[PDB]
Structure formats: C-alpha cells, structure tokens
Structure 1
Amino acid sequence: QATINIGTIGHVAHGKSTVVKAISGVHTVRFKNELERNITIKLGYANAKIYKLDDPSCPRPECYRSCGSSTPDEFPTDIPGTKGNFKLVRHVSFVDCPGHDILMATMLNGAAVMDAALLLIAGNESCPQPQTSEHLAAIEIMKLKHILILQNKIDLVKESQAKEQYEQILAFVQGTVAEGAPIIPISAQLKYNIEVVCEYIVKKIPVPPRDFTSEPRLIVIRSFDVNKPGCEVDDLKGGVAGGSILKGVLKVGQEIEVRPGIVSKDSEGKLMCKPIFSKIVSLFAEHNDLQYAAPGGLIGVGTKIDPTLCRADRMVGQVLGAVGALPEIFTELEISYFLLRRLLGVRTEGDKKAAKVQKLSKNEVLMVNIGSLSTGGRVSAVKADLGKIVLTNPVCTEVGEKIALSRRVEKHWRLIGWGQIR
C-alpha cells in the first residue's frame, strides 16, 4: 500500500508535468479532448517508488544510466553504478495538489490527505512569492509540520535572482511559518539535480502514528476508473472511491459508509439527511488488486454505487468509516474565528489592497472547510470573532478542533482566516 503520502503544492505559471514525472515516472493528467495547459489546475495524483543502489543516486528502471528525455537537443547522463541491483527505500505515492487559488478548498483537502508537503517554486514572477505563506500557515493550523521546498523552473535564471527569490521569501515568512524547510534546486528542462529531491523525501519526512486496530476511518476525494464497454449497460463494475485510510484494518466484504451522505427527497429542509453505506466489493493499490488494507496509505475502494456518480469528481472531500459509526454530523455550525494579518493571494512591486481583513456580516455566504471536507455557510448570527451558521451540505469530524474560512472579498472566494467549533 504505502508508508507515507506526499503533496506536490505550488502557484500559477510554475509548471507541473516535468517535475511530477521526475520524482515518480508517472505523468499527472485529467482526460479531456483538449490541449494540456501549463498546470493540472485541480487535485490529482502520481503513483511512485523510491529506490537506490549501494551508493547515493536515483536510477531509471534500467539501473546503469540516468539518461534523460525532457529536451530534444541533448542527452544528460550519469552512471549510478555498473548495472547494480536496486533496493527499495519505502513505499510512497504523490498527491498532485491544485495549481490555482480558485480551488483553495480542494487545496486544504489535498494538504490534509498528504502526510508531508513538497512546495514548488519558479522564476516566472517577482521574488516575494505569496503562496509560501498561504499553504504553510494553513498546514501548521492543521498540525502537519512535515515540509520541503523545490525550485523547478530556473533553467535561464542567474544565481543572484534565485537568491533574491529565496531571501525575500525568507524575510516574508516571519509572521506565518517557521523557516526550517530545506530547499532543493533542479532544472525543469534538463532533469539536473532531481535525484536530490528523492534523497530529501527520505531525509526530512517521518512515518506518522496511526491506530491499526481501532474503528475504521477513511478520507475519499476521487472518482476512480469505470468504463463504457459492456454487454450489460448498468452497474457492470460499480463505482470506485479513491482515498487514504486514517484508522483501522479494512477488508473486502466489510460494510463501509460516508458520514454526510445525502438530503432525502420530499424533506422540507435540513431534516432527514442520512449517511450512505454498502459492502466493499474490491480493493486496488500499487497496480495490484487486494483483499485487505491498512491505515497510512493511498488506496482505491470498490462499491456497489451507480457509475453516473463517478463520471466526474462528485466525491471530493468526504469522510468514511464503519457502518453506524459515532462521529458527529453537522448541517449547522457554532463557530469562533481569527483572521489573517494581511490580504493574500498575489503580489508585485508595492501594495495592492494588502491591508487587514474587514469584519464579516450576516447578509453573505462563506466557503468553510473542516477536517478534509468543504461546504457553503450562511449566517444566523455573527460578530467580528464569533458566529452561528447553517450549511448547504453536511460535514463531519472526530473532534471540532479547527475550521478554515473563505469570504467573497471579490468575485470568487479567498481564504481570510481560521477558527474552531464552540
């Protein structure tokens, strides 16, 4: 399955494809009859292995040469060793986090399903790049301290401008996160130095505690593969959920459920909403089928549901567990909150409305996030630090420790702060 799961995180115009291939061998993609843009804009994945010879290097699947293919005019090459037998370090897979702040709820969810972060940096915009606070301040508030930095698109950038970038970032983080994350430089075009990223995901990142025998918990985000061909047109395979198990051993034929579920039809409102449950039909990980599974790793879980739920990611940010589980389900929320010391998202040569956030009012709709879920929140009562709200879809957590808060401060919602349940 896996020992750890790593989120590749960044900002607009930094690229994706070359570096996500360099750390895994896998092209991150979403299927569309259209051209591939500079970024995978919405949350994805890349399956991987990490392995070495007897001496520090990251080989190709043929071990004798590191020979590249990302540039048409050159063959950059080194010898890891004289065709030595490779050794696996540990089982790992990557969470391909959103490329634009428009998906900030899905980004907080991606940052919750990872055990650690890779934060990606590029020369395409001015030095004090703001997402170095925006991700890492939320990541500290969701208590996930495990962080690394990766300087990607610098193929034509001088060492003094590469310095000015990391040094204006090092000055900027003083109010938002600890400086203690290592930086790895690479080339995006030449695949130069990329095996140091592999070494640092062994060097910096620990294996986290989980309970192997306590009651099942799972986070789901992805509608996994089901396909059109068949002699019976309905329910040939059933819908498959892509997720990561938080807690408990899991097995084929076990009854599993999703906590927020759905609102029942012919209800007059938030009443009569219920969990949804079924027996697990199959399991998938590491390009193999399974009968059993464990906490701490990315997995596909097979279910009896209609594939019409799976033709798109309807299943973004959902919490799952054993049928009839305890954890409280919220369709309305009691909140206490705090707001960021600057407005955030983009920057240039001098101030662009970067002042402190204006207080909330009841005539508005929030986007609000808890655990690894998301919902839209409408106010019943509020003050500048405290409130009471009703939710357009239900949400769930094992404890009410934290929430994250986004406001329509302009045409689409931006993060403005965080809070707790009362």
Structure 2
Amino acid sequence: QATINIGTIGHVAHGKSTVVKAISGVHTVRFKNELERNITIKLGYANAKIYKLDDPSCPRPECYRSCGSSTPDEFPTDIPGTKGNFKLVRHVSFVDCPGHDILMATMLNGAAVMDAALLLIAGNESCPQPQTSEHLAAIEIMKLKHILILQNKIDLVKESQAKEQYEQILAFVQGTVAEGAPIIPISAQLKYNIEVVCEYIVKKIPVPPRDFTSEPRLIVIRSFDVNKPGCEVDDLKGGVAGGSILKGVLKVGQEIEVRPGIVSKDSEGKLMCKPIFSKIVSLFAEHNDLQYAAPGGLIGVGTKIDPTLCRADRMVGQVLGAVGALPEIFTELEISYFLLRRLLGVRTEGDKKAAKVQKLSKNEVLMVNIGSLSTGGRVSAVKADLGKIVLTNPVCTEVGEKIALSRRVEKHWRLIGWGQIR
C-alpha cells in the first residue's frame, strides 16, 4: 500500500520524468499524451516499493547491477549489491504536484495531503528563484518540515553557479525551516547519487503517528477513468476516487459520504447542500489487492458513484467522511487571516515586481484554498483580523486547521497570505 506521501514539487525546467522514474519506477502521466510542453503540469500519481539488501541503496528487481539509459553519451552504472532476494522495508507513495506557477492553486491542493516533500531545484535560472520560496513557505504553514532539498538539474551547470544558488535560497529562507533539511546534489542525466537519496528518505522521513482508531476521512484529489470499455454497458459499475486518507482505517464495504454536497434544486439562497452517499466497492493501492485502507497513504477507492462525476476531473479537493460525518458544510465562512509583507511566488532578476500588496477591498473574488478544497468566494466584510467570505460551492471544514489565501494580481491568482478558520 503506502506509509508516507513524499511530494515532488519543483519549478520549471528540471525534468520530471527522469527523476520520478528513478525514485518510484512509475511514470508521471495524465491527459494529453502526447507528452508535456516541458515538465508535468498535471497532478501525477505513483506508488513504489522500497527494499534493502541490508545496504542504504535501494535495489531494482534485478539487484546485481543497474545500467541506466538516461543518455548514450556515456554509460551510467551503479551497483546496489548482489542477489538472493531483498528485504521489504516499506511501501512508499508519491504526490507529483504541478511544476508551473499558474497552476499554484492546484499545487497547493495536492501538496496539502502529503507527509513530506522534495524540493526539485534547477540551476539554470535565477539563484533565489520565486517558486522555491513559495513552496517552502506553504509547507511550513500546512504542518510539515520533513523536507529534503534536491538539486535536480546541475548536469551542465558549473560548480560556482550551483553553489551560489544553494547559498542564496538557504539565506533568503532564513525564517523558514531548511537548516535541518539536507541538500543532495544529484545528476539527472547520469542518475548519480540516487543511492544516497534512498538513505536520506528513510532517515529524514519516518512514518509519522497515524490515528487508526479515529473516524475515516478520505480527501479526494483525482477522479477516475471509469468506465466505458467492455463488455456490458452503459455508465459504469462505478467511479474511482484517487484520494489520500489522513485519519482512520477505511475498511472495504464501508459506506462513505462526500460532504461538500450537491445543492438542492431551485435554491433562492446559498443553502441547502445535501451530501452524496456511495458504498465502497474496492480499495486498490499499488498493484496489489487489499481489504483495508490504512491512513497515511494514497489509495484508489472505487465507490458506487456513477460515470458523470468521474468523466472529467471534477472531484478535485472534495472531503469524504465515513458516514454521516460530523464536519460542518459552510457556505459562508469566518476567516481569521494574516498577510505576507511581500508578494510571494513572483520575483525576477530586476526589481519588477515584488513588494507590499495593498489591503483587500470588499466584493472582490479571491481563491480560498481551505483543506485540499479550492473554492472561489467574495469578501463581504473586511476587517483586518476578521473577514467574512461567501463561497460559490460549499466547503466541508474537517477542522479549523489552516487556509491559504490568494488574490488575482494579474492573469492568475498569486499567494498573498494564510490564516486559520474560526
């Protein structure tokens, strides 16, 4: 299954497929294939098995040696050991977030259900690069600090440039946790020092305490392509949710409720929403059958919903509770909030632009990323430490946790501040 969710976030032009296939062995893929204008801009999924030969390096199935195929310029070979079967240490899960700035709201959502991260830095561009800081700050807000910085694209980048970049990032982030996070330079054109990464992810990132006894909550981020094959139609025996569970052991045959709900017919107001109920058909993770779905892992829960809800990616950031979950489904919400004194996620080579953003004004639409949900809503009252927001689609608030608040600076929204629900 899975034990931890390590995320693979990283700004434009570092190469995703080479690094993702080295760590998991499962390609990051999605709609439009095709391939990728550059690096994956979709929310990729992948799981993997991490075993040892009693060595800090992680074998392949063929554990005698491993000859790469990253480049035919030279032969990159590494040796994990010699063969006689290897001991299974754990089953790991990844969360490949978008690597592009416009997709920030999606990157936030996907990130918010991980248990650790890997900041994929690229040495090609600017030293205190916008997105590195954006990522790091969001991570410390959500409730994580289990980060391993990875210098992923320094294959042709000289050692002065690459040294200056790690220095400037680590010096800018002087108020964000990063001093207890290692910085592992690797090759992505010769897959070198990959074996030492395997030592790091088992060290810096154990399994955090998971609450089995507590009531099941599944947070779905990705829909399912079911169905439409054959034989026997139409619509499906139904619809599969790619979600991570962050609380409770969800057992097979259990009934689960999707709690933001669907709005009642001919509503004259903003109420009333009614949750949808679906019975769990199957609990699939990796490529191995399971009867349970332990928390701390990203699992494909097939449920008895019908094709229309899964025919496109429409279940991004929905909260699912088993069953008749107590969590309130607000339509208008009381945010406590604070703002950054800089505009995060933007800063280029020349002061233009990135400074203090002006105070929020009422009746402006802002993206409130609450939980893994992403709703848009307008601010109806605006006091400094008390704003009232009215949301277009209702938000199930599992706990008052955190929020991330963004404002439409130009073409798309950009992160301005965070806070906590009251």
Runs of at least 5 residues in structure 2 that lack an aligned partner in the other structure: none
**In the alignment, what sits opposite 1:59?**
59
Give SS of 1:13's match: coil
Deviations 1:128-150 (A, max 9, x none): 11222211212111111211111
Note the C-alpha offset of 1:252.
2.2
Note the C-alpha offset of 1:82.
3.1
| Alignment partner of 1:78 is 2:78 | yes
Tell me the distance in 2 between the aligned counterparts of 1:65 and 1:34. Answer: 32
Deviations 1:43-94 (A, max 9, x none): 1212211122133322221000121111123321133223342222211011
Note the C-alpha offset of 1:333.
0.9
Tell me the distance in 1 between the aligned counterparts of 2:384 and 2:211. Answer: 39
CA 1:35–1:216: 2 relative to 1, 3 Å: closer
- Check the 8 A contact 1:223/1:313 in 2, yes or no: yes
CA 1:401–1:245: 2 relative to 1, 3 Å: closer
Tell me the distance in 1 between the aligned counterparts of 2:172 and 2:159. Answer: 20
- Check the 8 A contact 1:133/1:177 in 2, yes or no: no
Structure with the bigger percentage of strand: 2
Note the C-alpha offset of 1:178.
4.2
CA 1:335–1:153: 2 relative to 1, 3 Å: same
Tell me the distance in 2 between the aligned counterparts of 1:398 and 1:317. Answer: 12
More off after superposition, 146-155 vs 232-241: 232-241
More off after superposition, 123-132 vs 228-237: 228-237
- Check the 8 A contact 2:228/2:236 in 1, yes or no: no
CA 1:33–1:140: 2 relative to 1, 3 Å: closer
Tell me the distance in 2 between the aligned counterparts of 1:148 and 1:294. Answer: 25
Alignment of 1:96-115 (within 5 A): 96-115=96-115
- Check the 8 A contact 1:243/1:299 in 2, yes or no: yes
**In the alignment, what sits opposite 2:383?**
383
**In the alignment, what sits opposite 1:132?**
132
Runs of at least 5 residues in structure 1 that lack an aligned partner in the other structure: none
Deviations 1:188-215 (A, max 9, x none): 1111111222211101012111221222
Note the C-alpha offset of 1:186.
1.0
Give SS of 2:168's match: helix
**In the alignment, what sits opposite 1:242?**
242
Give SS of 1:416's match: strand
Deviations 1:244-303 (A, max 9, x none): 122222222211001102112222231121111121111101202322222121111111
CA 1:157–1:221: 2 relative to 1, 3 Å: same
Give SS of 1:301's match: strand
Note the C-alpha offset of 1:311.
2.5
Tell me the distance in 1 between the aligned counterparts of 2:313 and 2:264. Answer: 21
More off after superposition, 101-110 vs 401-410: 101-110
Tell me the distance in 2 between the aligned counterparts of 1:46 and 1:210. Answer: 21
Give SS of 2:67's match: coil
CA 1:137–1:33: 2 relative to 1, 3 Å: closer
Tell me the distance in 2 between the aligned counterparts of 1:306 and 1:153. Answer: 43
Tell me the distance in 2 between the aligned counterparts of 1:213 and 1:45. Answer: 27
TM norm structure 1: 0.96
- Check the 8 A contact 2:2/2:47 in 1, yes or no: no
